[PDB]
Design an enzyme around this catalytic site. Sequence first.
Site, mmCIF file in Angstrom:
data_model
loop_
_atom_site.group_PDB
_atom_site.id
_atom_site.type_symbol
_atom_site.label_atom_id
_atom_site.label_comp_id
_atom_site.label_asym_id
_atom_site.label_seq_id
_atom_site.Cartn_x
_atom_site.Cartn_y
_atom_site.Cartn_z
ATOM 1 N N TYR A 118 -63.689 37.691 -49.279
ATOM 2 C CA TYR A 118 -62.723 38.057 -48.250
ATOM 3 C C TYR A 118 -62.079 39.412 -48.415
ATOM 4 O O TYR A 118 -61.526 39.916 -47.417
ATOM 5 C CB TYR A 118 -61.592 37.005 -48.168
ATOM 6 C CG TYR A 118 -62.070 35.735 -47.533
ATOM 7 C CD1 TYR A 118 -62.694 34.729 -48.266
ATOM 8 C CD2 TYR A 118 -61.969 35.564 -46.166
ATOM 9 C CE1 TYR A 118 -63.159 33.596 -47.636
ATOM 10 C CE2 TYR A 118 -62.438 34.426 -45.542
ATOM 11 C CZ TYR A 118 -63.028 33.442 -46.277
ATOM 12 O OH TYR A 118 -63.492 32.343 -45.609
ATOM 13 N N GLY B 68 -61.873 42.909 -48.165
ATOM 14 C CA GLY B 68 -62.629 43.957 -47.487
ATOM 15 C C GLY B 68 -63.117 43.495 -46.131
ATOM 16 O O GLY B 68 -62.680 42.487 -45.556
HETATM 17 CA CA LIG Z 1 -61.424 40.583 -45.162
#
Ligand SMILES: [Ca+2]
Length: 123
Positions: A28, A30
């Site tokens: 998750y 980025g």
């Molecule tokens: Ca993300």
Amino acid sequence: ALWQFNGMIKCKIPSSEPLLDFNNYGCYCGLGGSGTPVDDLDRCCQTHDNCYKQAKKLDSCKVLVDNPYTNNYSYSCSNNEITCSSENNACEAFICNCDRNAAICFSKVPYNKEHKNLDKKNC
Ligand SMILES: [Ca+2]
Ligand SMILES: [Cl-]
């Protein structure tokens, strides 16, 4: 926007270069984010992603044609504490709170370097 969020992360984690440490971490942290979070830091990023989803649904943000990624809220950092500006409008304030919550979360969880640059087939 990204500049304020990065500054918040450095406020809470003064040893970090966020745009190098936290980007492309887990499933998750980025761009995108799907699957089961791999650890508590990844869960911080999942929560943050979800907070942006909710910001996009907020009436204030919709009427302002807001993008959470570009939001122009104000904040300050003093003694490693983040304060979202009281002058922020409701949309700005919501997004500032998403970012502050995430920076605090990141500062409170272990960093598991085996999850940096995780292949998203694991997601
Ligand atoms: Ca993300
Ligand atoms: Cl804080």
